[PDB]
């Protein structure tokens, strides 16, 4: 059934709860962002109100074919009333259209649901600065101190420099970026921009990017593969076998592939700083795993929570084992004692 951390107490609201059938007493279903583990269950047959960002709403309409009458997009940073409850959507710094939701409950309690987020100091200057938060539903994906990775900007700097050098040294090299969902678009957009090329992709991926309100997107992306020297492929094809096969389809136009696998955190990232990252190479194909994260590092998560000073924290990730739940509560306790709330 629907887990407790997906229900907002004192309301008829659920968050990211689309795979449990009709949730008893739910009058509005919130969707934090368009990632399959969150929209799972939504389809053209859904007949309840869905509240979300404009971008998420574009994807619901065009990709899942949810009926327009059930899509309720809300602007960011704006007090809105939904079923008699004041709510605000805030940028989650996750993927395009991803939001955190602030609920102002009728009894005076204030709840922040982060959805998925990458905590950032800029969030300390949103509407969050203005009032106390009694409950925090926290994206705890990387809630352990071993989860370190660089900033997104540092990872992009590495990717741009690596691609620019390779193509400047060999104008016949092809750059390939793997993708499986929305998010992490900056990897391929920044590489294509430095190389003066558009990004070539399948019709399905092109359709998805057309829903993202990305400025000047028609100048950046294309389905014309051969006119482009940065190609997007499904993540599962970013291996030597899949890349060798892709190189044949190009028709003697390229003699080298440099490929990027933007992963999340990897244990290798503790040893090797972003500047020391080296690829796996087989012949004329090199594959760079790069730690581009759209979730908070441990340090980013700790800073955000210690600033927010919530009275109670409900984790939404890694909640499956006694060990994982215990470890997270121990960190919350440490953060609270250190900061004094
Ligand atoms: C290792 C931690 C990172 N996060 C997940 O474990 C995760 N991420 C997903 N997609 C990403 C894009 C996302 O951010 N979604 O919200 C999944 C999609 C389908 C099934 C399981 C999924 N697990
Ligand atoms: Zn996500
Ligand atoms: Zn997720």
* Ligand in nearest proximity to the CA of 142: 1
Breaks (C-N over 2.5 A) in the chain follow: none
Q: Which residue has the tokens 């294509």?
A: 192
Cα–ligand 2 centroid distance for 35 (angstroms): 5
Contact (CB, 8 A) for 290 and 187: yes
Cα–ligand 1 centroid distance for 196 (angstroms): 32
Q: What radius of gyration, in Å, describes the C-alpha atoms of the chain?
A: 21
Is the CB of residue 198 below 6 angstroms from any atom belonging to ligand 1?
A: no
The partner residues of 87 in beta bridges, in order of sequence, read 80, 103
Is the CB of residue 227 below 6 angstroms from any atom belonging to ligand 1?
A: no
How many Cα atoms are found within 13 Å in the side-chain-facing hemisphere of 23? 26
What resolution (Å)? Answer: 1.5
Is the CB of residue 19 below 6 angstroms from any atom belonging to ligand 1?
A: no
Q: Give the SS3 label for residue 8.
A: strand
Q: Please give the C-alpha separations between residue 259 and each of 95, 188, 224, 288, 328, in angstroms, as whole numbers.
A: 21, 11, 19, 6, 36
Helix 152-169 crosses helix 185-195 at what angle (to 10 degrees)? 40
Is the CB of residue 38 below 6 angstroms from any atom belonging to ligand 1?
A: yes
Eight-state DSSP code of residue 340: T
126 closest CA partner among 79, 94, 166: 79
Burial 319-330 (b: 16+ CB within 10 A, else e): eeeeebeeebee
Eight-state DSSP code of residue 160: H
The partner residues of 178 in beta bridges, in order of sequence, read 233
**How far is it, in rounded angstroms, from Cα 152 to Cα 294?**
8
**How far is it, in rounded angstroms, from Cα 310 to Cα 338?**
14
Burial of residue 249 (number of CB atoms within 10 Å: 0-12, 13-18, 19+): exposed
3-class secondary structure per residue, 161-190: HHHHHHHHHCCCEEEEEEECCCCCHHHHHH
Cα–ligand 2 centroid distance for 63 (angstroms): 17
Eight-state DSSP code of residue 76: B
Q: Which domains does the chain have, with CATH numbers?
A: 1-147+296-341 (3.60.15.10), 148-295 (3.40.50.12650)
Contact (CB, 8 A) for 197 and 228: yes
**How far is it, in rounded angstroms, from Cα 153 to Cα 341?**
32
**How far is it, in rounded angstroms, from Cα 142 to Cα 148?**
9
**How far is it, in rounded angstroms, from Cα 14 to Cα 4?**
9
């Amino acid at each position: 059934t629907c887990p407790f951390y997906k229900k907002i107490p004192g309301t008829g609201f659920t968050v990211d709860a689309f795979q449990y059938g009709v949730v008893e007493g739910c009058t509005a279903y919130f969707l934090t962002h368009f990632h399959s583990d969150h929209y799972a269950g939504l389809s053209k047959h859904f007949t309840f109100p869905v509240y979300c960002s404009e971008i998420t709403g574009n994807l619901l309409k065009n990709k899942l074919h949810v009926q327009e009458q059930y899509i309720h997009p809300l602007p960011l940073d704006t007090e809105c009333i939904v079923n008699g409850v004041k709510v605000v959507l805030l940028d989650a710094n996750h993927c395009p259209g991803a939001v955190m939701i602030l609920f102002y409950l009728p009894n005076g309690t204030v709840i922040l649901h982060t959805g998925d987020f990458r905590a950032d100091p800029s969030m300390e200057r949103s509407l969050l600065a203005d009032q106390k938060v009694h409950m925090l539903y926290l994206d705890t994906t990387y809630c352990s101190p071993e989860y370190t990775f660089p900033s997104q900007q540092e990872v992009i700097r590495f990717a741009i420099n690596t691609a620019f050098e390779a193509v400047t040294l060999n104008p016949h090299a092809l750059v390939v970026c793997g993708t499986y969902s929305i998010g992490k678009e900056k990897v391929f957009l920044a590489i294509a921009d430095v190389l003066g090329s558009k990004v070539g992709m399948s019709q399905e991926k092109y359709k998805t990017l057309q829903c993202l309100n990305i400025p000047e997107i028609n100048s950046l992306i294309t389905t014309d593969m051969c006119s482009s020297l940065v190609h997007l492929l499904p993540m599962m094809q970013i291996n030597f076998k899949g890349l060798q096969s892709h190189l044949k389809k190009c028709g003697g136009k390229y003699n080298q592939i440099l490929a990027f696998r933007p992963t999340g955190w990897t244990h290798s990232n503790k040893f090797t700083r972003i500047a020391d990252v080296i690829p796996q190479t087989k012949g004329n194909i090199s594959i760079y795993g790069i730690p581009y994260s759209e979730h908070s590092s441990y340090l980013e998560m700790k800073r955000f929570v210690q600033w927010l000073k919530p009275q109670k924290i409900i984790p939404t990730v890694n909640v499956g084992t006694w060990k994982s739940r215990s470890t997270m509560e121990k960190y919350f306790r440490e953060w609270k004692l250190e900061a004094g709330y």
